[PDB]
Amino acid sequence: EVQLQQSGAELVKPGASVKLSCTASGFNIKDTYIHWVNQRPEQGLEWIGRIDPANGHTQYDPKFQGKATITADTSSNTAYLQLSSLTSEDTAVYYCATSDYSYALDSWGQGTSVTVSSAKTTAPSVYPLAPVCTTGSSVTLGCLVKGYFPEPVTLTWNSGSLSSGVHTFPAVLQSDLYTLSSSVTVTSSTWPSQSITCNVAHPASSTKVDKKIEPR
Amino acid sequence: DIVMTQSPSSLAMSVGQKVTMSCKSSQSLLNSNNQKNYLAWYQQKPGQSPKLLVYFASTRESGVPDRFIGSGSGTDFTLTISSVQAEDLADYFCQQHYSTPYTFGGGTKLEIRRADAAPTVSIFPPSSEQLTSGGASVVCFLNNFYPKDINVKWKIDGSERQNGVLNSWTDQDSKDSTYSMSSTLTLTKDEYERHNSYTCEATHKTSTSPIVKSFNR
Amino acid sequence: CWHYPPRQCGVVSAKTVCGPVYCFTPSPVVVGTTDVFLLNSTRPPLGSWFGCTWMNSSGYTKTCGAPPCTTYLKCGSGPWLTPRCLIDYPYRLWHYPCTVNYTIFKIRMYVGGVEHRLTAACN
Ligand SMILES: *[C@@H]1O[C@H](CO)[C@@H](O)[C@H](O)[C@H]1NC(C)=O
Ligand SMILES: *[C@@H]1O[C@H](CO)[C@@H](O)[C@H](O)[C@H]1NC(C)=O
């Protein structure tokens, strides 16, 4: 199976430079073109360039010439995208993709989220949201992930085991701290007594918090 | 560069109906030596990475449902979903993969039309942990409603509060086709302690009557 | 080339080959000794390789396939995908010198539902 594993999220100051990696498995990257594409928040897709890992030969969208550099290391089946002199306008999700001779993009990595900002990293406070002080054969718990930076965080309920009934909401806002929330709805039974915990990772601040939800 | 233009910007159809969207290139994508048109279609489900549906205008990618059908030639292209499914909600992109730079269309957002649904509402007071760190957020969840457009009035003692309140919508659900929404009134710990009580009102087209959740203390 | 379509693979002596023995799954792999010989295999949805290619002492490019009947999936006997194209690999230009004029292309191929990425030299 053709698979592309991309490196983790990046915070990077303006003017600075960052290097992303794309690691392929289940095939040899020599036999493909590896492309990079970006997607700015709520926006469309845009080709950056590609490389022939058999060649080293690269092609770019002239507009990215000078700011993007694609390379590849065939001994580790990995391609790289180096970006330099970044600005806020480059804040985006960066994807790598395979093509054959056709250049149609047939397989895609999960993407790498790159935030360009002067703001300092901040870990979030994580607040268990319990219902007020009973049961209409349905009950909803909440998790409030507050005041962090940058995007992203990952939230799960009891380590992913609990998934249906889950609504996790896109982060806001602010000045300049993000706030995110998640609701989980379960059958009024198994809560309480069977305990529900939301699990939040803010990778940027190396934060990993499990907050059990408890009756007030 | 070749300009790609997609139509329409958004789409809404109910499950089972036929879906149609189009793509115009500023010039021919026809490889003469090949008699192939180098146009591709991609699907991007919310929070996921794009995935290839069709390439060479009409050749369907391996592992892609037969309901997905790309057609046309020259400078006019269409992607059609013969009978749409709940899971097909996505942004759809065309791309010419003919010449560098391989340019993409601006995308068509496909949504699923379904029956009206009123939200399930839940109000949550600030946790203890947050009140120690000196703050107070009241959180209101409005889940599994349709259509997207909903309004939340946060009432503190019958008097509307419109500052400190933040709102956030999910994308459309890939199974029941609803939306959910989070509303979070955040005040000062003692602004929260100075007052009582706290209410959020969910006014939807689905009723004359507001769904209302509240609490005291 | 000399082209030559070949017979079932069978066992080749652990002392006749000069260099490596490549087999094509269609992906180019390199087979070895005991646990370089026994290239027995049916077509790779079910079985290991479509065919192989090596080089005896005399400097002759030896090939072997499976019993001859994408049409390559049904019945292919090694490196050749079409009469005009063969699967590229390190020892391609040794094993197939007549093909140095061939243009190389990157391609995709499905075998029993698993995707292979190959480079092909054509014409
Ligand atoms: C090499 O191959 C040629 C032709 O296939 C054959 O006649 C010869 O016997 C082979 N020599 C050895 C040492 O295998
Ligand atoms: C490649 O095709 C051309 C055109 O028919 C011809 O030279 C020959 O068939 C092939 N060349 C070689 C070296 O096999």
Domain boundaries along the sequence of chain C: 1-123
Inter-CA distances, C36 with A206, B28, B34, C13, C40, Å: 51, 53, 42, 7, 12
**Domain ends where: A95, A118, A141?**
A118
**Nearest CB partner across the interface for C118, out of A31, A98, A99:** A31
Contact B120, A140 (CB under 8 A): yes
Rounded distance, CA B126 to CA B135, Å?
8
The CA distance from B18 to the nearest CA of chain A, in Å, is 24
User: Which residue range is the domain that position A86 belongs to?
Assistant: 1-118
Give me C119's structure tokens: 């480079």
Are residues A175 and A125 part of one domain? yes
Are residues A174 and A209 part of one domain? yes
Rounded distance, CA A154 to CA A176, Å?
19
Give me A165's structure tokens: 């009934």
Are residues A194 and A88 part of one domain? no
Are residues A149 and A95 part of one domain? no
Give me B29's structure tokens: 């994508």
Q: How many CB atoms lie within 10 A of CB A205?
A: 15
Q: What total of structural domains would you count in chain A?
A: 2
Q: What total of structural domains would you count in chain B?
A: 2
Are residues B190 and B110 part of one domain? no
Assign C40 to helix, strand or coil. Answer: coil
Are residues B163 and B58 part of one domain? no
Rounded distance, CA B156 to CA A92, Å?
39
Peptide bond into B8 cis (omega under 30): yes
Are residues B141 and B93 part of one domain? no
Inter-CA distances, C23 with A112, B10, C51, C61, Å: 37, 51, 6, 13
Distance C123 CA to ligand 2 centre (A): 7
Give me A58's structure tokens: 């690269």
Pairing assessment for the beta strands B51-55 and B39-44 based on DSSP bridges: antiparallel
Assign A191 to helix, strand or coil. Answer: coil
Cβ–Cβ below 8 Å for C117 and A2: yes
Name the β-bridge partners of B186.
Answer: B137
Q: The domain that contains A61 carries what CATH number?
A: 2.60.40.10
For tokens 């999910």, what's the residue?
B170
Are residues A51 and A145 part of one domain? no
> Which spans in B51-184 are helix H?
128-132
Which residue out of A31, A34, A52 would a mutagenesis test of the C interface target, given it has the greatest number of C Cβ atoms within 10 Å? A31
Are residues B127 and B108 part of one domain? no
Experimental method, per PDB record: X-ray
Cβ–Cβ below 8 Å for A31 and C115: no
For tokens 């010419």, what's the residue?
B96
Listed in sequence order, the residues at least 6 apart from A157 whose beta carbon sits closer than 8 Å to its beta carbon are: A143, A163, A166, A182, A184, A196, A197, A198, A199
Which residue out of A1, A2, A102, A197 would a mutagenesis test of the B interface target, given it has the greatest number of B Cβ atoms within 10 Å? A102
Are residues A125 and A72 part of one domain? no
User: Which residue range is the domain that position B153 belongs to?
Assistant: 115-213
Are residues A199 and A132 part of one domain? yes
**Domain ends where: A66, A85, A118?**
A118
